[PDB]
Amino acid sequence: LAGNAARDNKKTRIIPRHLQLAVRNDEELNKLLGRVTIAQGGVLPNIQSVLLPK
């Protein structure tokens, strides 16, 4: 999955951000890594509706 992500981001070497993306985006891996914070991982893009402009 991380390689998949890296291809989507058009990169050749997997970097942490790719790992974080693969983990969090997938449901089962995210559940498995429920109590893990990945260095240089960041968060998945996500904006709550009511915050969005009208």
């Binding site: 260095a39 240089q40 998945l44 893009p45 996500n46 904006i47 709550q48 009511v50 915050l51």
Partner: protein, 97 residues
Amino acid sequence: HRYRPGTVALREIRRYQKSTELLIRKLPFQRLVREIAQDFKTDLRFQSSAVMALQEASEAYLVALFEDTNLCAIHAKRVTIMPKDIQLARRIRGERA
């Protein structure tokens, strides 16, 4: 001209959520850590790697906490996180009493 209040915030959210670089400048954070550490033992040294790990954990925890806080404030029909929101979040988490 002028951007309407509440727009540049959305841009910054898009901006920061796409990157992973730390958001607290290193040196003040490091000095805070050393100050805090001093109160448990004197004349202590830290591997820079250790400080980086501390910063990683702290920022990740804070981001999670704010995520929960925003969720609470939205539930309270609000758009501005307020201290009571963080208190409620931590309380439900079980961290605060």
